[PDB]
Each structure stands twice: as C-alpha cells, then as structure tokens.
Design a protein around this ligand. Structure first.
Ligand SMILES: [Mg+2]
Ligand SMILES: [Mg+2]
Ligand SMILES: [Mg+2]
Ligand SMILES: [Mg+2]
Ligand SMILES: [Mg+2]
Ligand SMILES: [Mg+2]
Ligand SMILES: [Mg+2]
Ligand SMILES: [Mg+2]
Ligand SMILES: [Mg+2]
Ligand SMILES: [Mg+2]
Ligand SMILES: [Mg+2]
Ligand SMILES: [Mg+2]
Ligand SMILES: [Mg+2]
Ligand SMILES: [Mg+2]
Ligand SMILES: [Mg+2]
Ligand SMILES: [Mg+2]
Ligand SMILES: [Mg+2]
Ligand SMILES: [Mg+2]
Ligand SMILES: [Mg+2]
Ligand SMILES: [Mg+2]
Ligand SMILES: [Mg+2]
Ligand SMILES: [Mg+2]
Ligand SMILES: [Mg+2]
Ligand SMILES: [Mg+2]
Ligand SMILES: [Mg+2]
Ligand SMILES: [Mg+2]
Ligand SMILES: [Mg+2]
Ligand SMILES: [Mg+2]
Ligand SMILES: [Mg+2]
Ligand SMILES: [Mg+2]
Ligand SMILES: [Mg+2]
Ligand SMILES: [Mg+2]
Ligand SMILES: [Mg+2]
Ligand SMILES: [Mg+2]
Ligand SMILES: [Mg+2]
Ligand SMILES: [Mg+2]
Ligand SMILES: [Mg+2]
Ligand SMILES: [Mg+2]
Ligand SMILES: [Mg+2]
Ligand SMILES: [Mg+2]
Ligand SMILES: [Mg+2]
Ligand SMILES: [Mg+2]
Ligand SMILES: [Mg+2]
Ligand SMILES: [Mg+2]
Ligand SMILES: [Mg+2]
Ligand SMILES: [Mg+2]
Ligand SMILES: [Mg+2]
Ligand SMILES: [Mg+2]
Ligand SMILES: [Mg+2]
Ligand SMILES: [Mg+2]
Ligand SMILES: [Mg+2]
Ligand SMILES: [Mg+2]
Ligand SMILES: [Mg+2]
Ligand SMILES: [Mg+2]
Ligand SMILES: [Mg+2]
Ligand SMILES: [Mg+2]
Ligand SMILES: [Mg+2]
Ligand SMILES: [Mg+2]
Ligand SMILES: [Mg+2]
Ligand SMILES: [Mg+2]
Ligand SMILES: [Mg+2]
Ligand SMILES: [Mg+2]
Ligand SMILES: [Mg+2]
Ligand SMILES: [Mg+2]
Ligand SMILES: [Mg+2]
Ligand SMILES: [Mg+2]
Ligand SMILES: [Mg+2]
Ligand SMILES: [Mg+2]
Ligand SMILES: [Mg+2]
Ligand SMILES: [Mg+2]
Ligand SMILES: [Mg+2]
Ligand SMILES: [Mg+2]
Ligand SMILES: [Mg+2]
Ligand SMILES: [Mg+2]
Ligand SMILES: [Mg+2]
Ligand SMILES: [Mg+2]
Ligand SMILES: [Mg+2]
Ligand SMILES: [Mg+2]
Ligand SMILES: [Mg+2]
Ligand SMILES: [Mg+2]
Ligand SMILES: [Mg+2]
Ligand SMILES: [Mg+2]
Ligand SMILES: [Mg+2]
Ligand SMILES: [Mg+2]
Ligand SMILES: [Mg+2]
Ligand SMILES: [Mg+2]
Ligand SMILES: [Mg+2]
Ligand SMILES: [Mg+2]
Ligand SMILES: [Mg+2]
Ligand SMILES: [Mg+2]
Ligand SMILES: [Mg+2]
Ligand SMILES: [Mg+2]
Ligand SMILES: [Mg+2]
Ligand SMILES: [Mg+2]
Ligand SMILES: [Mg+2]
Ligand SMILES: [Mg+2]
Ligand SMILES: [Mg+2]
Ligand SMILES: [Mg+2]
Ligand SMILES: [Mg+2]
Ligand SMILES: [Mg+2]
Ligand SMILES: [Mg+2]
Ligand SMILES: [Mg+2]
Ligand SMILES: [Mg+2]
Ligand SMILES: [Mg+2]
Ligand SMILES: [Mg+2]
Ligand SMILES: [Mg+2]
Ligand SMILES: [Mg+2]
Ligand SMILES: [Mg+2]
Ligand SMILES: [Mg+2]
Ligand SMILES: [Mg+2]
Ligand SMILES: [Mg+2]
Ligand SMILES: [Mg+2]
Ligand SMILES: [Mg+2]
Ligand SMILES: [Mg+2]
Ligand SMILES: [Mg+2]
Ligand SMILES: [Mg+2]
Ligand SMILES: [Mg+2]
Ligand SMILES: [Mg+2]
Ligand SMILES: [Mg+2]
Ligand SMILES: [Mg+2]
Ligand SMILES: [Mg+2]
Ligand SMILES: [Mg+2]
Ligand SMILES: [Mg+2]
Ligand SMILES: [Mg+2]
Ligand SMILES: [Mg+2]
Ligand SMILES: [Mg+2]
Ligand SMILES: [Mg+2]
Ligand SMILES: [Mg+2]
Ligand SMILES: [Mg+2]
Ligand SMILES: [Mg+2]
Ligand SMILES: [Mg+2]
Ligand SMILES: [Mg+2]
Ligand SMILES: [Mg+2]
Ligand SMILES: [Mg+2]
Ligand SMILES: [Mg+2]
Ligand SMILES: [Mg+2]
Ligand SMILES: [Mg+2]
Ligand SMILES: [Mg+2]
Ligand SMILES: [Mg+2]
Ligand SMILES: [Mg+2]
Ligand SMILES: [Mg+2]
Ligand SMILES: [Mg+2]
Ligand SMILES: [Mg+2]
Ligand SMILES: [Mg+2]
Ligand SMILES: [Mg+2]
Lengths: 119, 109, 171, 72
RNA sequence: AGACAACCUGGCGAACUGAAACAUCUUAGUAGCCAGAGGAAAAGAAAGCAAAAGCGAUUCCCGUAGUAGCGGCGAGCGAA
RNA sequence: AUCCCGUGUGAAUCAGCAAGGACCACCUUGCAAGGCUAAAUACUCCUGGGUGACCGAUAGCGAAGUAGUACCGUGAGGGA
RNA sequence: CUGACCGCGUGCCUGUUGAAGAAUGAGCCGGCGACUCAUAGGCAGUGGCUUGGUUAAGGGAACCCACCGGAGCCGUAGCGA
RNA sequence: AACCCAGAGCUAGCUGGUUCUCCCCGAAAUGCGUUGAGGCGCAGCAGUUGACUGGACAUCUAGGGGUAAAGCACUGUUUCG
RNA sequence: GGCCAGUGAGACGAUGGGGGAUAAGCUUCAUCGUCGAGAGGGAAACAGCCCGGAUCACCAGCUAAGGCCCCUAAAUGACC
RNA sequence: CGGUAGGGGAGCGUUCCGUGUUAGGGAGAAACGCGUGCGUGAGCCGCGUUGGACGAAGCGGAAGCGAGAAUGUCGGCUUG
RNA sequence: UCGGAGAGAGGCUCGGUGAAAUAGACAUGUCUGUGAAGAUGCGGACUACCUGCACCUGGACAGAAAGACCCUAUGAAGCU
RNA sequence: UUCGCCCAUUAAAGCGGUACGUGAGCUGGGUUCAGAACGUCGUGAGACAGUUCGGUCCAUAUCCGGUGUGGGCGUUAGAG
C-alpha cells in the first residue's frame, strides 16, 4: 500500500516556522536554516535561564554596595553583610536591593540598627 | 649484529605462598634450577617443579645456613566463628534473599 | 506481538544513522557476510582439528537397529494380564511412535524398572537382564524369527559339514 | 521448495555430540612425528575433549541440525 | 517455405562472481546465439527397482533429507 | 558400477544374454541393439469472466493527449 | 508587534586523538529517495494441546473456510570407528 | 583495445548516505593470530536474562621477591700508590 | 551460564623508563588522572591543567578552585 | 536520574483493511489557515468572512510508514 | 636605455534586448594573541557615517573534479 | 640555478623576513607527462635524483582590502 508522505512533513515544518518568526533575514524564511536557528534559540534560552539567576545576584549586590557606601566613610558591602549576619537578620539580596531603591530611608534605618547593636 | 630476537616470558615463580592452602598435586613453585629445595610432604619434579603431596598450609624454611626449602604441613580447621562479622553479614544476605523472595507471591491486590 | 525495530528512522527512536553497525568496514557493509566458520585467515578451528574416527575414512556411520523399550514403559502402560505386547500393540497404546526408518525396524527389550504382571511378549531380541527379569516374573518370552539370510549351497555344505563333525564327536 | 539451511559438512566430520548434548572433538597432532613425543603426551592427545566454550558459536552456526544443549 | 510474448526440445556455449588471491572446483550447462515443433513439449510400456519380503510404463507435488555420499574432503555440490 | 560418444578391435541366442556400485561364484530380477502414444506438469503476445488491506498523473505500463511519437544517433540503439 | 542599551552566545552534518574551522557536503524550496521479502536454524515473549504434539502435499459450496488427509516430523537410550 | 544491447541490481574488506519522540543502562581504542596491517576470528571491557553466592570500601597480620637506595663478597671496569 | 552488541587509528597530563641529542605538541612500554563520551566555574581567549560530575523549576541561600582600583562580581581592608 | 558507539523499555504519527453501506457531513467533509487550549515529546483537542464532497473516535490488523544532508534525484525559483 | 604621441575595435554614458560559472545563512575592518599549530566570525586593543560608480587584484586556505606526484586495494588493464 | 666568477665603474655596489614575498599580475625552468636519441643497468618489457632535442593554463571581481570619484544623511532654522 503506497504512502505519499503528504502533510506530515509540512505540518512539522510549519510548527517550526512559527517559532522562528521575527528572525532577521533568511533565518525567518528557509526551512533548513530555520531548523538550526530554532535549536540555537532554544539552547540559549536554556543557558540563560541559568545565567539569569547569576546576573541578578550580580546586580543586586552591586546596587547594595552603592546604597551603603554613602553612609560611613569606611563602610562596604562586605562589612554590611557580615554585620547583617552577626545580628541575625534573614533579608536576602533582592529585598535589600529593592528596598535600597524604592524605600531608601528604610535602608538607612537598618544600617542604624546594625550600628546601634555593634555599639 | 642485528638484534631483536627474544622469548615469551615463561611463567616461572612461586604459585602458592607461605601459609596459604594446597591440594595434593598442587604446584607450589616452578623454577629453572632449584632456588628452593623439597622439604617434607613435598615432591620434586623433573624440571625441579615443587608440588604438594598433602592438603595443608605451605611453609618456607631456612635449609641452612643459606638456602631455602619448602614443606607442607597439615593444618586444623575447627575454629568456625559462630558469631562474628563474617558470619553475621553472610547470614544476613541469606535471610534477606529468603525474605525478599517470600514477600513476592505473598503480595495481595 | 512485540513491535519490530525499524532501523534507520530517527535517532531518538532506536538504531538510527548507522543502525547499530557502528562505524565501517566489513560488518557494516551491505551484502553477504563472511563464512560462519571462518576466522580472519588464521587456520579455522574446524580445519586445524582432525576428522572424527570412523567418518574420516568412509566407514559407514553407526545406526540404531532396534526400537529399544524398557520395562518402565510396559509398567506405566495399561497392560492387564495375558495381554500380548508385541510391536503392534505398542503402537496401539502409542508408547512408540515409529517414523520411516523406525517403521522398517524390529523390536528389542531392555531391562529397566521391575515389571509386576504376567505378560505374553513378542520381540526379535532381548538383553540378558531383560529376559532374566521377565522369566523371573513368570512372563512368556516369544522370540520372533528374523528373515533368513540367503546363502549359496556350497556354504551350506561347509556349515553343515561342521555340524556333522560335532554330532559324530559327541555321539 | 524453499531453501533450507545446509549443514557445513567439513565441520560435521570434525565435531559431534554426546547424549547429554555437549559438543566434543579429537585433539590435534597425533598423526606423524610421534616418535619424538613421549608416551604420556601421546595418551593425552588420544582422548575426546569438550570444545572450548569460546568457539561454541562458530561451530553451532555452521551445524544447524546438530541437537545441542548449551545447558540453560 | 515466412511470422510467432513466455514456456519446451535439440545444437553451440561464456565471463565477471564465490573460493576473502588462484589454477582443480564454483558461477552454470545459466545467459546469449542458431535451428525445431506444440498447445503443451519432452519422457514413457522394464535388457527397471529391490533384497531373500516384495513391486509392476512415463511425468509432477509432499516427504525421506540437507540424511547417504561427493569435494584443492576447501568454497561448496547433493541423491535414491 | 550403470548411462552415452571418438579411434581400434569385436561376441553369444534362451543348455543364452544383461542388471543387481571393481571383480568371481550362487541365487533373484529382466529381455538392449525397430517404432508410436492421452492425462496429471510448465507458461502469458493474449480472449472471456471474476476478485484486489493494488497505483491515482514524480505513482501505475516507457506511454490516461502525435508514444515507441517528438527529438538524438551513420547504425545497432537510445527516448521524454 | 516593534527594540534604546547591557550581559551571555566559535552555523549544521559527516568524520576524527582532536574542529568555529582555512576538512568534506548542501544555491534555495517542494516532491521522490535506504536493514525489505521468501524459505530454513537458534533464542526469547505469548497462546493451544499435553488421554505425547502436529500435520505436508492433496480434497474443499471459486477464494477464505467446516470437515478431512497420519505419509512424515519432533520427544521417549546410550556407548562405541 | 571501437560502439550498442545482454549476462547485470556484476564485484567494491572503499567512500558517501541511512528519516518520529521520551525513559533506563553504557563502553573501547588492549592482548593473540592473520597474504595481516584502514579488514576479520577469539579474548578483554557493554546491554538484557537466569543460577548460585558474599562480599566490596576500610583496618591489621603473614608470604615469597631482588627494584630504589646501598656495596665491593663475586663478574667486569678504573685511577694512583 | 544464555541471548546479543560495539570496540580492536587513541590524545595529552603526573610518574618509572627505553630509542633520540636525558631534542621534539617526537616515538615506544609500564602504574594512574582527565578528554574521548563531560556541560558549569577558574585559567584574557584556550579537548587533555585546577574545582566539580548537569532530572527539572525559582528575580532564594552557603561554599570549592579561584579572586576583592576601573573595564568586571567582591577590601582604594588590617598589621609586619 | 551527563553521555558517543551501542543494548533495553514505553510511546506518537502516516496510508490502507476489519467493525462499516459506521457516528458525523452543501445547517460545509477532507484539506488549508489559525490558537492567551492540553501534553515529557512525537503530537492531540478546539476554531475559522478559506475550501466544495467525503469520512472520524474507540478496539484491532498490514505496510511502498516519518528526510536536512547521499558532488543524491526531478521540477520550480533565485544569486551573480 | 625610457618611454612618447596618434588611428581603429572594446572599455565608459544613454536607449533596446539580456546570459553564465558560482552560491549553508551571511548584519562579511586592521593589528596582535589564541586555536587542528597561517581567524571578518574566539580574546585584547585600535580604526571605522550610509550607500553608489570607475578602476586594481593582496586575501577569502577564491572558482573550474579525484591528486597527474606518494601510499593503500589479496582493485583494473597493457606489455615482458 | 641558491652559490659563484669576472669586466668597467662607484660614496657604497649589505645581509635577512614577507607561502620562489608577488602564477584569479607577467615569464623561464621545475612536478624530468606522452615523441626521439646517447651512455649505463636489465635475457626482456623498460629503468636512471645521468645527459640531450621537442613539448597547452584558463579567468566578465560577489565580499574584504586598495586608488580615485560622487550621491544621501548628519552637523538642532536654512544657506553662500
Ligand atoms: Mg493511496
Ligand atoms: Mg517516502
Ligand atoms: Mg522579539
Ligand atoms: Mg625471558
Ligand atoms: Mg620420574
Ligand atoms: Mg520486520
Ligand atoms: Mg527500541
Ligand atoms: Mg542524521
Ligand atoms: Mg547491530
Ligand atoms: Mg557513515
Ligand atoms: Mg565494525
Ligand atoms: Mg561484499
Ligand atoms: Mg555461503
Ligand atoms: Mg585422515
Ligand atoms: Mg554414534
Ligand atoms: Mg522418533
Ligand atoms: Mg538422544
Ligand atoms: Mg595413523
Ligand atoms: Mg558472538
Ligand atoms: Mg516455419
Ligand atoms: Mg526462419
Ligand atoms: Mg505456433
Ligand atoms: Mg573463473
Ligand atoms: Mg577470474
Ligand atoms: Mg551473490
Ligand atoms: Mg575470488
Ligand atoms: Mg575475494
Ligand atoms: Mg495439458
Ligand atoms: Mg510427444
Ligand atoms: Mg504393460
Ligand atoms: Mg515391451
Ligand atoms: Mg542398467
Ligand atoms: Mg541401481
Ligand atoms: Mg556392462
Ligand atoms: Mg555423449
Ligand atoms: Mg549371435
Ligand atoms: Mg531386471
Ligand atoms: Mg530382443
Ligand atoms: Mg544398453
Ligand atoms: Mg523397446
Ligand atoms: Mg517419443
Ligand atoms: Mg506533471
Ligand atoms: Mg508517468
Ligand atoms: Mg496533483
Ligand atoms: Mg546586543
Ligand atoms: Mg565570549
Ligand atoms: Mg561578542
Ligand atoms: Mg587527519
Ligand atoms: Mg565550511
Ligand atoms: Mg575533521
Ligand atoms: Mg583530516
Ligand atoms: Mg542535493
Ligand atoms: Mg559547496
Ligand atoms: Mg522508505
Ligand atoms: Mg541484513
Ligand atoms: Mg523474514
Ligand atoms: Mg523462525
Ligand atoms: Mg507452551
Ligand atoms: Mg490444506
Ligand atoms: Mg485445490
Ligand atoms: Mg485451495
Ligand atoms: Mg592494434
Ligand atoms: Mg574499453
Ligand atoms: Mg551473473
Ligand atoms: Mg551489487
Ligand atoms: Mg552498478
Ligand atoms: Mg574482483
Ligand atoms: Mg549513568
Ligand atoms: Mg586507554
Ligand atoms: Mg583493507
Ligand atoms: Mg569481536
Ligand atoms: Mg556485562
Ligand atoms: Mg623479605
Ligand atoms: Mg616484604
Ligand atoms: Mg640477594
Ligand atoms: Mg633483574
Ligand atoms: Mg642504583
Ligand atoms: Mg671489586
Ligand atoms: Mg676491584
Ligand atoms: Mg591488531
Ligand atoms: Mg594501531
Ligand atoms: Mg576506524
Ligand atoms: Mg604523553
Ligand atoms: Mg609520560
Ligand atoms: Mg631504573
Ligand atoms: Mg645531557
Ligand atoms: Mg623519554
Ligand atoms: Mg605523541
Ligand atoms: Mg589532582
Ligand atoms: Mg571516537
Ligand atoms: Mg569521563
Ligand atoms: Mg570543562
Ligand atoms: Mg571559562
Ligand atoms: Mg575530578
Ligand atoms: Mg550530583
Ligand atoms: Mg558568602
Ligand atoms: Mg566593582
Ligand atoms: Mg592597601
Ligand atoms: Mg547526576
Ligand atoms: Mg541518561
Ligand atoms: Mg545511542
Ligand atoms: Mg489520527
Ligand atoms: Mg487516513
Ligand atoms: Mg450515513
Ligand atoms: Mg472542519
Ligand atoms: Mg483521506
Ligand atoms: Mg488534529
Ligand atoms: Mg487519536
Ligand atoms: Mg458537489
Ligand atoms: Mg476506524
Ligand atoms: Mg487524519
Ligand atoms: Mg520503498
Ligand atoms: Mg531537498
Ligand atoms: Mg554545485
Ligand atoms: Mg535543480
Ligand atoms: Mg599612450
Ligand atoms: Mg587611442
Ligand atoms: Mg563589435
Ligand atoms: Mg544598457
Ligand atoms: Mg542557473
Ligand atoms: Mg557592516
Ligand atoms: Mg598555538
Ligand atoms: Mg592569527
Ligand atoms: Mg576579532
Ligand atoms: Mg560574536
Ligand atoms: Mg584578489
Ligand atoms: Mg586585472
Ligand atoms: Mg570563512
Ligand atoms: Mg592485502
Ligand atoms: Mg588480483
Ligand atoms: Mg670612486
Ligand atoms: Mg666619501
Ligand atoms: Mg628583500
Ligand atoms: Mg624573487
Ligand atoms: Mg596570487
Ligand atoms: Mg626543458
Ligand atoms: Mg644489454
Ligand atoms: Mg644508477
Ligand atoms: Mg619546434
Ligand atoms: Mg562590486
Ligand atoms: Mg571597497
Ligand atoms: Mg565617500
Ligand atoms: Mg560626501
Ligand atoms: Mg541639514
Ligand atoms: Mg545637509
């Protein structure tokens, strides 16, 4: 019983093409290229969902270091953090970064508690 | 002149060591000349292969003053450890095989 | 019904690409292989070993000449006393199914197991232990004649001259 | 009329089977040059040996009608 | 008298190939070519099988059997 | 062995002759060197019926239209 | 849907000790395009019978198929040339 | 050593290719033989299936040995006295 | 034991050596690690070096090797 | 619970057959196009200001059964 | 030496007609370093508005398929 | 031919790298291709890190790189 491949192929191709919408140039056109480009996209995605978790801690820490450095002459990120722990506070770095921007006065207070107690 | 011929290593040398176990007939040493001498309960071959005549522990000795001789002595194994680490774990394996095979066909539902 | 491997479709499936033939060279190449009994050109095992005893020269192979039966089988079978055993009645109860070569054969009895009954047995031959156990159990042993070997007259004269010698000597 | 496997004949003049189903063979080398082989060796080369597990494949493959138990 | 797909009979009759080379062997009396006749052809009415018991022209199928055998006793071939 | 042929020699007639796997004896079986014969079996250029887990215009015949055509080749031939 | 700017990111296949390779292959797109069938041997998984199992050709209200068809074949003794 | 057709789908231990998805386990590039060396047979090391088993990782003791070091008792070699 | 595979061109690194010139990213063995068939981090980039062996999600947290002037995460830290 | 060669398990789809002259379908089937739908994925389920007559699901069966590589191959269309 | 001028046919512009080899996709700098040991594509610096046209040929291991040379094949053929 | 030798000068007539720096810029030899001849080796077909005469390399610049020469746009209203 002869079987033409029929649409079984074209569907697959089409469902790939949908993926690759808005790729500049022949990456959005030719099937054969589109394949690869799909794979690479998916791959980067996977990679950078891991990079992401690295990079926001990067960021947050940076912003925090900026936010503290303003108060004391001699004060750091490092110093700060060590002080947060020996005072037993749980706040992670996302929260201290977002509170650094969006509620600056709060961070000033926190610093004043760590200082009072280290005193 | 031009070298490069040689021989497969003949497999000579001590086959069973001191205080290991030997069967009767079991070869203790293959040697070229006699680097050892036959002791008691122990025969020697044509190539000076030394072999055991009796089951037991093989012991090397000073032939005196210089050379060495090997002889075989009958041992005694009574001391089976009733309760010890060895016995405990081997038993455990037995009983686990038994249990784990018996709770199969003994499974409801 | 277990579904078959279709090789050469996809990798994620199964044996794709190479199909499980690994890389290249003779075993992965299409076509008849190399002979089953052949090792690389080293003298093959079967060729470096000498031919079996009689076969080697054309001495005819040894062949079964009777259908062997023990007493075990005659016990297990439903034989009531007086019953004739023979060949035929063993096909009847089926404990022997003869094929072509076996059809053309006679019957022989081999002692094993201990028979309890009185049977009337017919066969062309018996082992020693056989007819010993049989005549011990009170069974009648009928030994059937084999087909005469044709002999030309001169050899009858010789073999008879013998018998006349023995007869004149004992008498 | 299909095709049925052929017994490899040069393999069947060499190997055979024992009643319990293991393959056996002769030993090589007792043919000529016996004078210089000691009697003890000659006796050893006279007997029937069960074929090495290793070759069982090749053999079995070339003697398809040999009834053989590999002890399973 | 010529024409006529395949089948068939007769005549000539390869080689690549397999044998991990090759020469005996294999391929295969296959392809091809020539000639011939038919709807089938050919074979066929025991100077035959068999084995001390029997059969009763030829052809074809199943089986015996990948058995007996043949064979650089190799590759392989293979009955009744 | 049996069977059939080149060269050369070359018998016996039933009180014979041949075969029975070198050969000889014995027995068994058969009657060569004249012919002819149906069926069971092989095949599809085809004809008539039937069916199709066969194709559906890149498939199915090379050919669903000028198809062995157009075209190519001195020619055998290739060939949409 | 677009994308200011930051970060990360050395086409695919084949094949290799090893490739982004300046190693091979693909202009692009759509079709066609490859472990198939028959017959045996071995092994496994499932059934069926185990009053041992099974039929081959053949016959069948055309096929299939009921019902036949035990000739064969496998298992019941080995040792030995 | 012409062409065309056929044997012919010759043969190619060579090169190229061999198409759906998920899950589990997971090598080797070594030895021997080979008209063999880029091939193949067997072993070694995969997977899956059974039958036996009781170990492994540690700790300590016991064996035989002739390397590193060391030495001049032998075999060479060597300087001066 | 059964059934049934690949593999039989290896690379460097540590160490023991031979060949070579105690030359070679050379060559050939021996006992190991990694790559092969291993992604992540450190090594500017960088198969074989160091850390560590990736079921998967998280805009959570602690560390290894390695680092804390700016590019670029952390001390323009302390004391000799 | 990394993974190549490679082995084993569990699945999805394509055309056809059985159920079957089936359910459904000019009140719009196949197909073609779409989705804030559901799947570990192969894919499924839903929707159409296209299309114009066929044809599921379930439980089974069979293969000319899944393509991106063959300096593959045939058409179409580019680049220069 | 040591080039010069001129004439024709092109080259160049305009109108008409209009190919080809090539080609994974190309958003296609230089230096230096790295790397299968000669990189637009990886690193660090440096230089670079966008895009035509005419010219030039250093690169893209430029293009036109088996490498004639070397080796392999138990390949092929010719010759002795 | 790398090397080198000489003639006449000269301030001096440097040595190296750039794939012989440079063959899609040019041209000789060299890969001694097929013809032929000599010496030599080989019975021979033929051979030679011997000699000798003859003996086909193509190219419309895609991109980078370059020498020139424009347009667009920017230069915060538009221009000379
Ligand atoms: Mg169809
Ligand atoms: Mg197809
Ligand atoms: Mg986007
Ligand atoms: Mg030695
Ligand atoms: Mg003695
Ligand atoms: Mg199949
Ligand atoms: Mg599978
Ligand atoms: Mg692939
Ligand atoms: Mg396989
Ligand atoms: Mg391949
Ligand atoms: Mg292989
Ligand atoms: Mg082949
Ligand atoms: Mg064969
Ligand atoms: Mg012999
Ligand atoms: Mg026998
Ligand atoms: Mg039988
Ligand atoms: Mg038997
Ligand atoms: Mg003899
Ligand atoms: Mg095997
Ligand atoms: Mg006529
Ligand atoms: Mg005629
Ligand atoms: Mg006619
Ligand atoms: Mg031949
Ligand atoms: Mg030939
Ligand atoms: Mg063939
Ligand atoms: Mg051959
Ligand atoms: Mg061959
Ligand atoms: Mg007829
Ligand atoms: Mg006739
Ligand atoms: Mg008659
Ligand atoms: Mg007559
Ligand atoms: Mg005759
Ligand atoms: Mg006869
Ligand atoms: Mg005669
Ligand atoms: Mg003749
Ligand atoms: Mg006469
Ligand atoms: Mg007769
Ligand atoms: Mg007559
Ligand atoms: Mg005659
Ligand atoms: Mg007649
Ligand atoms: Mg006639
Ligand atoms: Mg058409
Ligand atoms: Mg057509
Ligand atoms: Mg159509
Ligand atoms: Mg960016
Ligand atoms: Mg990067
Ligand atoms: Mg970048
Ligand atoms: Mg290479
Ligand atoms: Mg490339
Ligand atoms: Mg490569
Ligand atoms: Mg290479
Ligand atoms: Mg192609
Ligand atoms: Mg290309
Ligand atoms: Mg296919
Ligand atoms: Mg196959
Ligand atoms: Mg099959
Ligand atoms: Mg089968
Ligand atoms: Mg069963
Ligand atoms: Mg029938
Ligand atoms: Mg019929
Ligand atoms: Mg019928
Ligand atoms: Mg001529
Ligand atoms: Mg020719
Ligand atoms: Mg042929
Ligand atoms: Mg072929
Ligand atoms: Mg061909
Ligand atoms: Mg050939
Ligand atoms: Mg694992
Ligand atoms: Mg290794
Ligand atoms: Mg080879
Ligand atoms: Mg192997
Ligand atoms: Mg294993
Ligand atoms: Mg010691
Ligand atoms: Mg010690
Ligand atoms: Mg010593
Ligand atoms: Mg030593
Ligand atoms: Mg020393
Ligand atoms: Mg000394
Ligand atoms: Mg001394
Ligand atoms: Mg080897
Ligand atoms: Mg090697
Ligand atoms: Mg290989
Ligand atoms: Mg190394
Ligand atoms: Mg080393
Ligand atoms: Mg040493
Ligand atoms: Mg030195
Ligand atoms: Mg060294
Ligand atoms: Mg090396
Ligand atoms: Mg370490
Ligand atoms: Mg590999
Ligand atoms: Mg690893
Ligand atoms: Mg890594
Ligand atoms: Mg890194
Ligand atoms: Mg590690
Ligand atoms: Mg882990
Ligand atoms: Mg921390
Ligand atoms: Mg910083
Ligand atoms: Mg400081
Ligand atoms: Mg893991
Ligand atoms: Mg896994
Ligand atoms: Mg795999
Ligand atoms: Mg469906
Ligand atoms: Mg359908
Ligand atoms: Mg209806
Ligand atoms: Mg619809
Ligand atoms: Mg349909
Ligand atoms: Mg659907
Ligand atoms: Mg469905
Ligand atoms: Mg209508
Ligand atoms: Mg249905
Ligand atoms: Mg459908
Ligand atoms: Mg097909
Ligand atoms: Mg294509
Ligand atoms: Mg091309
Ligand atoms: Mg084309
Ligand atoms: Mg001029
Ligand atoms: Mg002019
Ligand atoms: Mg003109
Ligand atoms: Mg113009
Ligand atoms: Mg074109
Ligand atoms: Mg650009
Ligand atoms: Mg380097
Ligand atoms: Mg570079
Ligand atoms: Mg760069
Ligand atoms: Mg980049
Ligand atoms: Mg250029
Ligand atoms: Mg030019
Ligand atoms: Mg490139
Ligand atoms: Mg060879
Ligand atoms: Mg040859
Ligand atoms: Mg001067
Ligand atoms: Mg001066
Ligand atoms: Mg220069
Ligand atoms: Mg120059
Ligand atoms: Mg150039
Ligand atoms: Mg010249
Ligand atoms: Mg001469
Ligand atoms: Mg010379
Ligand atoms: Mg001339
Ligand atoms: Mg241009
Ligand atoms: Mg330019
Ligand atoms: Mg400009
Ligand atoms: Mg301008
Ligand atoms: Mg302006
Ligand atoms: Mg302006």
């Amino acid at each position: 019983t002869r079987v033409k491949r029929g649409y079984i192929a074209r569907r697959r191709r089409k469902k790939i093409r949908f993926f690759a919408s808005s790729f500049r140039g022949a990456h959005s056109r030719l099937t054969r290229t589109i394949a690869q480009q799909k794979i690479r996209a998916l791959v980067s995605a996977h990679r950078d969902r891991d990079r992401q978790k690295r990079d926001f801690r990067r960021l947050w820490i940076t912003r925090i270091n900026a936010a503290i450095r303003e108060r004391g002459v001699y004060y750091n990120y490092s110093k700060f953090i060590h002080d947060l722990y020996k005072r037993q506070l749980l706040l992670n770095r996302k929260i201290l970064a977002q509170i650094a921007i969006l509620n600056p006065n709060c961070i000033y207070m926190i610093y004043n508690e760590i200082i009072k107690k280290e005193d | 002149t031009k070298n490069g011929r040689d021989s497969k290593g003949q497999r000579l040398g001590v086959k069973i060591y001191g205080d290991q176990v030997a069967k009767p007939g079991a070869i203790i040493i293959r040697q070229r000349g006699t680097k050892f001498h036959p002791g008691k309960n122990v025969g020697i071959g044509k190539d000076h292969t030394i072999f055991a005549l009796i089951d037991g522990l093989v012991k090397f000795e000073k032939y005196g003053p210089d050379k060495k001789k090997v002889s075989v002595y009958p041992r005694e194994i009574q001391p089976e450890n009733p309760n010890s680490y060895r016995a405990r774990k081997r038993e455990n394996f037995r009983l686990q095989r038994e249990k784990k095979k018996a709770r199969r066909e003994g499974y409801s539902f | 019904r277990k579904k078959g491997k279709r090789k050469g479709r996809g990798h994620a499936a199964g044996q794709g690409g190479s199909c499980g033939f690994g890389m290249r060279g003779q075993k992965s190449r299409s076509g008849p292989g190399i002979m089953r009994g052949f090792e690389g050109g080293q003298m093959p095992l079967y060729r470096r070993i000498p031919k079996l005893r009689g076969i080697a020269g054309g001495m005819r192979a040894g062949l079964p000449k009777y259908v062997p039966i023990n007493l075990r089988d005659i016990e297990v079978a439903g034989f009531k006393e007086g019953e004739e055993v023979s060949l035929e009645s063993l096909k009847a109860k089926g404990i022997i199914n003869p094929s072509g070569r076996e059809r053309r054969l006679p019957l022989k009895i081999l002692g094993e197991g201990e028979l309890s009954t009185k049977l009337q047995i017919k066969a062309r031959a018996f082992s020693g232990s056989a007819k010993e156990k049989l005549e011990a159990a009170g069974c009648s042993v009928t030994v059937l004649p084999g087909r005469k070997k044709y002999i030309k007259e001169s050899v009858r004269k010789n073999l008879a001259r013998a018998d006349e010698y023995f007869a004149k000597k004992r008498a | 009329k299909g095709y049925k496997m052929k017994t490899h004949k040069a393999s069947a003049k060499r190997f055979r089977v024992t009643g319990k189903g293991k393959i056996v063979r002769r030993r090589a080398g007792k043919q000529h040059l016996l004078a210089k082989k000691n009697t003890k060796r000659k006796n050893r080369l006279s007997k029937l040996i069960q074929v090495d597990r290793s070759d069982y494949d090749n053999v079995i493959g070339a003697l398809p009608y040999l009834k053989v138990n590999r002890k399973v």
